[model samples]
Target: MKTIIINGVQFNTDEDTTILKFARDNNIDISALCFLNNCNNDINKCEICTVEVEGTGLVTACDTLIEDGMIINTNSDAVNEKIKSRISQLLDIHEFKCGPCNRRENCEFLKLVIKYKARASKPFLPKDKTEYVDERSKSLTVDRTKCLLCGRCVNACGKNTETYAMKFLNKNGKTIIGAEDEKCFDDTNCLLCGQCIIACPVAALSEKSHMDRVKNALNAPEKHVIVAMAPSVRASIGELFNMGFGVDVTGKIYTALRQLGFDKIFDINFGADMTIMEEATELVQRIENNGPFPMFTSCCPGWVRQAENYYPELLNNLSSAKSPQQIFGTASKTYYPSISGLDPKNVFTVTVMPCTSKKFEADRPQMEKDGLRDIDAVITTRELAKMIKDAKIPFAKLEDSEADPAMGEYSGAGAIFGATGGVMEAALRSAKDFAENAELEDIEYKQVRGLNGIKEAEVEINNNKYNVAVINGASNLFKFMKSGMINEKQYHFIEVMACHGGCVNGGGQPHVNPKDLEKVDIKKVRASVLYNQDEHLSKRKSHENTALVKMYQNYFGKPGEGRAHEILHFKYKK
Candidate 1:
């Protein structure tokens, strides 16, 4: 470790540390337009992350190496003025439309502008007019007029998803976002996972707004409005409502759903638990028979779509169990409605989830059950934020309440289904019993816990080695699936969740600024919330959930019964 003074505070930092990392980690201030990692000439494009070097004049901290005994003033009068001027120049060349941006809630540039008292008074003439790229596919395109070409989209595309579809084209101010090798997103090697949208700092990337459709649904005459809440929705909906991240807005969320005119407020965790029952039973059965090993979890629609399109070879390996949210929809209209004597047509099946892919999932032909589409519409956790705002409910102070009956009850294991490794643990807790008649004294699968790229665990049960793998990212999971398919590796089970760290860090959860990733432990915090939720819940095991027990004992017969498989289980695309 070498000693370095940042803003006059001396500390022993590592030799290879960058100035931006030093300042960020030590509470020092730095403006980095393209300085993602450290000090250098930050592209000279936006000149946001500039630092004063003793002998090097002004340099980009992103590419600059920290030298020993180099005294750097990050916030001196000269540096501040220089940084402000660079920002001002950028503002003049580009339009900072914070008013219409979805990012206004937690915008980094907006904060910088407020701090430096800067505004874009300088007018920038358009090169031609509006350049509308192909907006015909799944992704929403940039207006180009509002784009800053900060390359956040490029980072998310190549780094996050490894889907190198988007690229920055043209020279100087004419630069804009475009696909790298293909013309259309669908035709190209796009994952369609929307991590690019998540990486975008402004309204430069967003789903085309659905405010009009939502408004019409609310005011529909004969249409019955129903909202299906995903397991992750409760963990992160507070972000858009300004309650902040990891607020556990389940109660307020349920209350808001009721106030939003949703005919029923169903917990998707209930469906998740139901999925556990179905998936767990299936795993135990296949493992016991020593057939169809390495059963894949199918909760993540993003992973499902990716597998369907690219890895069709591994499709048969996917479990027939539908995602918990959609499974809940199947049970809602079929089992729940039948017992309550409600007309299926009058009851609209709407899913409230913390995932963008669920929008695409709801549209899949495979989601139909009993001659009717399982879910009518799927909204993101962000969309629920809008509905809460529309209801004019005081979201922050709403008292903790319980989800409505019919599908309100769930287990802790079911709650953590939103996170990575959770499915494997939950499955083992119950699946072992079905296979070997053994009860797990300890519910937590320690080996499978934590946020890792890939997780593996092996448990010896009844003369059998239950090998399991938990894949947290659909994009990373691509490598795992390819190896298994190419080499024909067979294992006991596999749990795959599309988002890294699973659904807790879903594309539609809280939108953390790329710069705020170090500031926030979203994965750990939300995992804690879900883990603690499971531990505190009276029903800690999916198989032990009272509601599921009742459904199984009274109406649905035993696990893997013909009726259960028909209503709760589904086949893969293969």
Candidate 2:
């Protein structure tokens, strides 16, 4: 630690600590832009983080390294003046569209402008004709008009895998961020993870809206609208309604979706239970037959897409089990309709998810049943909040209601699918029971819990040791893959999620302001909520879901052999 005096306040910090980090660590506010704490030295395009040092008069506090016995002025007149000028110039060139922007509440540039009290006194620059919108993929939309060229999105796209799916294109003295090929996004190595949407400080990137389609379906008398929501959605949807991080609104969500005119509201946790059954059965088969050494879980479509695009050699390693969202869609089209005697054509299944890749996954041909689409539409937790508000549904005040029968009932193992390493934990809970044919008291796999980038564990069932690994991010998975670790046979089973802290911090969750990013650990809080629910539930293992067991007995026979495999699992693009 080195002694430093920042704005007349003496403090101790390390040599690598930046001025902005030191100030923020000490609870002193300094206006900052283009300074992502996750990044070593942020993109630094805005240059609004001006601070005065003893030796260097004015410099960007974000990039400037701290020295021993250094004197710094974070709020000096010269520094403040420079910040104001930088923002004012930015306002002149940047698009001013905050009134109705989705990211208005979390815009980093706008936050900095307000903090610095900058005014656009200069003649405003006219809108550039080169500005355009890219909507090639149904999952993501890119609008150049609201972009700040901050480079945060670019860094986030390549954050884990070093796959530069997005880049800043310099043309005619104007810079616009885009994918590798000028007009081709899906053709490139883009994983459709929506991390770029999460990284953007403005409305430059967002999920393509299906609000109108949902509204149309609700109004149509012929359409029997059925909605199912992921476990993470219940953990995150409350945040939009001023509920603090990770407050489970599962019951309230059930009430809200019903009030929104859905014919039936289902729990995706049931699908998660179904996923565990298939994945666990597949793992046991792999162990028995000596097929694949490590069978990767295929619950996250984003991770699946990355694997398909980049790691083609490891395609067979991915389990043939469908994700929870896809399982719900398949059951809605086949089992639910068969049992209820409702026409499959009239049943329009919609998925409320925490991931943007789900929107992409819903469109995959492999997920479809016959000629009709399995899932008609997909919405994010953020989008569900908007629909709840638009319908004037009292989200916070609504009485807790139960989800409809059959697919609504789920086990605690299904609930934890929202958190990082949750699949591994859930599968292990079932694998123990499956191998022993007896319920285990120690269901909690603490080894696979928390927010580590990658986690490794071992379980001894019936005196046979099985190695497992959990990968929580696409970028982190890329490192493990490139290292040739899987070929070394370190793990017998693996679970991977594309978004870094799992679906809890997924791209489609509530948009968090950069200002509050340091103040809260939303993913950890949300994950804890799931873990707590798991501890309190009567049924903690996936194989323990009675409704699922009854379904297997009455309809599908068993997990991996019969109609279950035909409808609930399929090969991916790879």
Candidate 3:
């Protein structure tokens, strides 16, 4: 450890460590606007980590490497005043009118403007700030007027996660956070992973939401309302209700929805189990035939969109597995209907998920089954929390109840669809079962877990070697693909999730208090609960889900059958 002085305090910092990291490790919090760890050891926000050399003026500590006996003053009153004033200047120029920004919890703009007892007394004088030419790109807008120019996510795209689909375009105030060379998210290998949204530090970059459509649908009574709950919601929705995470409110959510007059209950895990049957079958066939080496998991919509866009070249390698939202809807309208005798037309299937883009997917053309759209409505975990509060149900003591028999049973593998690489592992669980004709006692594919930016490993199955890679963010996706570190034909399987920490940390999740997020990544904390749930589950693999096997034989003919395709397959847009 190198002995260092930060604002007169003696601390031990590792050699070559940035002063910002040193401050962070020592718990000396320095406030900054639009800064994040861009996968690099350095902070990628602005000049907030400003510190002075022993013989010079203040500079950003993030860029300054620590040397032995380095004397730095990051917390000097002069430095604090300078940064607070500079931040004040930026805040005045920023647009705070976007009430829809999910940063209600962790937005940098929200944090700085409220703290330091400072206000934007003066607005940034601009020659002119016009909205960038959006050109109708993949789903979101590029309103340059609101950007803070912090470049945290942009740097994340380049240096850390390396999803080089994004770049800094133009110069000065005119510069914007956009696709590299102004390319579309689909056109330039940009997976719409949404980690960039969180990086924007404010409401500048955000996914489009359907707040009005969801509201209007819930009010309509002629249609019977129902919710398909995802696994991660058990721990992540607390932020929306102003409750802390790690709270298991699934039963309370159901009770609240019941008060809202929902007629049935469903689990995304059910569809997840069904998806395992098909995806596992797909995997088994691919492995047997030695075809399509890297069968990319399609459970992530952002990754699915990316595959459709830039990698249309590799479409054959994509697993034809429909997501939980799509699969459950297929069963609800068909198999579940035959058993429950409910009119399929009156059934409204809404997926309560940690995803925002799922609404876009639910509206897509081929997601329907036999002409009836499978999922009638899609709500974010945050949206569901609001509904729970709106219904005035007691959340703390709600008792758990079994879901309806039609398509409700699921296993731990079925439940963990919320995280990166989980779907691939779930499919492999069943795939091995199908191939060996015997259930394996051990189901944990420990390789796929964790917060690694991009991870790769090889799996040995029945004397054959299968190379697999797991990518959690689009930034990571772009880097690995561009560098030739990954190829569809080389790796046997790939799992890609759009968000940085997967669904448990999706864009639609309740915002972490920016103050709290500086200390703890709520997404990681929520993800831990999910893994613990899986670790504790008695049955952890999908093939062992007897209900799934019974459903496939009794209703759908076989995995990948024409009837199954008609019910569960979907088309993609570039």
Q: Which candidate has the top score in lDDT?
A: 2
lDDT of 2 at 509: 84
- Tens digit of lDDT per residue, candidate 1, span 1-574? 7777776778886668677777777777776654332222224356667778766677667666788877787766777777788667667865565665566676666767778877666855566534543454443445565566777767666665665667777645566677654265656666556676776656566553444555676677766666768777788878777666677778887777777777777788888888888888888778767767667887787777677767787788788887887888887777776666677766677777667777666666777765777877766776667667657889888887677655778888888888889888888888876667777677778899888877888787667676788887866677675566423434678887767888887766657765667678888877777887887888778888787787777667776767788777777744
Highest TM-score against the true fold, candidate: 2
Provide the global lDDT of candidate 1 against the true structure.
0.72
lDDT of 3 by residue, 441-477 (tens): 8778878877887887777777677888889776677
RMSDs, each prediction?
Answer: 3.3, 2.3, 4.2
User: CA shift at 458, candidate 2, in angstroms?
Assistant: 1.9
Candidate 2 matches the true fold with a TM-score of 0.94
Better of 1 and 3 by TM-score: 1
Q: Rate the local accuracy (lDDT) of all candidates.
A: 0.72, 0.82, 0.70
Deviation in Å, model 2, residue 273 alpha carbon = 0.4
Candidate 2 off by > 4 Å? 1-3, 12-16, 40-44, 121-131
Residue 116 Cα positional deviation in candidate 3, in Å, after optimal superposition: 2.3
lDDT of 2 by residue, 134-251 (tens): 8778688887767777888888887754678888787577677888756656667887788888877778888878777788888999899999999898888898888777687889
Backbone N/Cα/C clashes per model: 17, 2, 4
lDDT of 2: 0.82
